[PDB]
Design a protein around this ligand. Structure first.
Ligand SMILES: Cc1cc2nc3c(=O)[nH]c(=O)nc-3n(C[C@H](O)[C@H](O)[C@H](O)CO)c2cc1C
Ligand SMILES: Cc1cc2nc3c(=O)[nH]c(=O)nc-3n(C[C@H](O)[C@H](O)[C@H](O)CO)c2cc1C
Ligand SMILES: Cc1cc2nc3c(=O)[nH]c(=O)nc-3n(C[C@H](O)[C@H](O)[C@H](O)CO)c2cc1C
Lengths: 265, 265, 265
């Protein structure tokens, strides 16, 4: 970790620990994609491309020696910067419990949006295809609370006709869930009725999408490949403040498209 | 504990024990604030002030030597007195099971109101700010039983956007709770429906406030600092009665304002 | 001592030692107050206030619960800065014995005046009262060498009438002492004659005051309270020079006013 020049910054260990503890808390709750996909362990700060497993033929027809080239996926690297104030940071040694750290939090939120955008909608220049692009896995639904229960029962049959098993999960918007909750009138609780038709599943509410989808959790269908995880480092100094940055390197892919169903309201 | 001149009073050990056992029972139920805040252990009868961690600059612009003063919070001390009757107290040795002790109980109640007043509404002359003064954490609500369930679901999203976690608690008035209970008609029980949306929380009913609020219980956001806990002592004697008093020393503060939400009906 | 960022400055250990050795010498001779008062050991960089031991009552007359606030003294913190030159400092490694360090010495003198000012004349905004403010302990004197000897004998009787004992000390100006020395003509030496009437005492000559005073040295009447002692640290760098500072935190008080007498010429 020597490429992050952390020992040339005028701070103490307590101040570094205070800065490190606050970002982990927000990253733990605002990264929504990492709750139902797989992660492949880090490879290092020198990894560059990931193989696909094919050949493209570039020679002509009547030649004696024939040749081609192999194919892969490139990785993405990012960086974002911010500033902090030294006299304000210096009261932690006199014994203040609460210190102002708002710019750090704002930058963390804007970084956390960037990865979910790629996981859900893909990147054109890199050659990545997202979860909402497979438009041969669609099912119509309605707005009454019983249409949802009918649609879940219909979807499990399509899952079983292909040989797919395992625990199942539902991912849905938030305003639609609130409307469903308000529609019912003092009946049996709706969350238990929903979890009975998934044979003991879960529910996840998010602001990233606009409709609902259903997935299976046996393992090995969506992969996120990491080279280096999220890290903080030091840049320079300007007369009363310091400048720091955040960085990461990754890519993503989908293997079996048969473990996914989309609902259209 | 020698500053309470308890060995110069004309009483026996049984009589002291009878007096001590009755006040603990009422203090255990009538102190409502101590159910969801933290307590920092006692420091002694000589503690005077608590540091804040800043400096205020009082010198001029072009001087060579510059100076200022440090800042802190002072503690509060209280005292309250009452009288008791000797011939009536003397039947405990002949073997009476029930003795009249009404003035003690009345004084205990009036002392217990005083601390909750400060915790919920602050003290101007000492420099304390209470829980109901942070008016940038407000949410509108309604009067039907489903508006409450909608508002809880809305509040948990605001909690998650800041990185705050942990078990959650609801604090509400008593007449409003009774009205909510009477509105429903033989449906599924309402207490279980409420505790399902808090993901397994609790409910606290009190007469000290007028509306509702929601808090988180991970630990370390509201602090009560004690020098000496509640104690009883002896003053003098007037020809058929004795005079006694109750005393304490404390202060209070709020650290993280992001773990609190107020509801407006 | 990590709050003084001393390991981020471009200097070597020999240069730090040369800088540290020169300030101690001047502080040892120019701090006049520390020769006859007591010192209470350091408490740390987080100490903020010192207790007095009283209560101020703020409630009304007919209330049932009465209350007040405790009282203390705040501490004073100071800081002063200066600059030094790198090429000039670099000849110490080639082997030069004498290096130019004049600004350091000038700043040290101006800092040393500041504390004696407070010890002898007090600070209004902080609530400190100095040694020259107790104007009920006065005695008239004259200008001949025998008036001084009469006044000392008169003062020891006032000391004995109150029960005060111990070795005694005289603190006097410098021009007046020179005039007294010039007045006499070849008699027995004057210093021995003065030290015989103090029963074996001492004499201290200073430029801080304008007349004389007499004190007793048994112990425990004037106190100087320290949080952090005098220290040197590093700030920044500007293209051929470096910037450093000096800091301290303290307060002062007088306990027994009966061990002090002032002489008026
Ligand atoms: C009493 C006092 C304390 C100060 N403490 C700090 C400090 O802890 N950290 C800081 O960066 N600046 C501090 N400063 C400001 C700093 O001294 C100033 O910006 C530069 O030294 C100006 O050359 C302080 C200033 C004063 C007057
Ligand atoms: C039979 C009798 C028993 C008494 N017992 C008590 C007693 O136990 N405690 C008490 O304070 N006064 C008691 N008194 C009242 C007490 O004697 C009276 O107030 C004073 O002694 C009058 O000088 C008693 C009086 C009588 C007549
Ligand atoms: C022969 C020579 C020796 C020097 N030695 C030093 C030195 O020991 N320390 C220093 O700060 N500058 C020194 N300087 C000046 C320094 O080289 C110059 O200010 C910067 O390098 C200009 O870019 C020296 C310059 C010369 C010509």
């Amino acid at each position: 970790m020597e490429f992050l020049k952390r020992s040339f910054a005028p701070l103490t260990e307590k101040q570094w620990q205070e800065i490190d503890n606050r970002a982990r808390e927000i990253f733990k709750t605002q990264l929504y994609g990492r709750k139902f996909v797989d992660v492949e362990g880090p490879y290092g700060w020198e990894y560059a491309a990931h193989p696909l497993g094919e050949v493209e033929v570039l020679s002509d027809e009547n030649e004696v020696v024939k040749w081609g080239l192999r194919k892969s996926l490139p990785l993405i690297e990012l960086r974002a910067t911010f500033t902090l104030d030294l006299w304000e940071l210096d009261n932690l040694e006199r014994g203040k419990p609460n210190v102002d750290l708002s710019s750090l939090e704002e930058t963390v939120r804007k970084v956390a949006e960037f990865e979910d955008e790629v996981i859900f909608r893909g990147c054109e220049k890199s050659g990545v295809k997202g979860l909402l692009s497979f438009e041969e896995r669609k099912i119509e639904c309605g707005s009454t609370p019983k249409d949802l229960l009918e649609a879940i029962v219909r979807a499990l049959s399509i899952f079983s006709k292909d040989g797919i098993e395992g625990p199942y999960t539902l991912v849905i918007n938030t305003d639609r869930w609130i409307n469903f909750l308000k529609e019912e009138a003092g009946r049996y609780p709706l969350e238990k009725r929903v979890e009975e038709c998934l044979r003991g599943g879960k529910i996840i509410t998010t602001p990233r999408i606009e409709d609902a989808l259903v997935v299976s959790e046996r393992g090995g269908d969506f992969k996120l490949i990491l080279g280096q995880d999220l890290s903080i480092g030091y840049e320079d100094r300007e007369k009363d403040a310091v400048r720091l940055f955040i960085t990461e390197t990754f890519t993503f892919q989908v293997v079996n498209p048969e473990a996914l169903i989309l609902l259209k309201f």
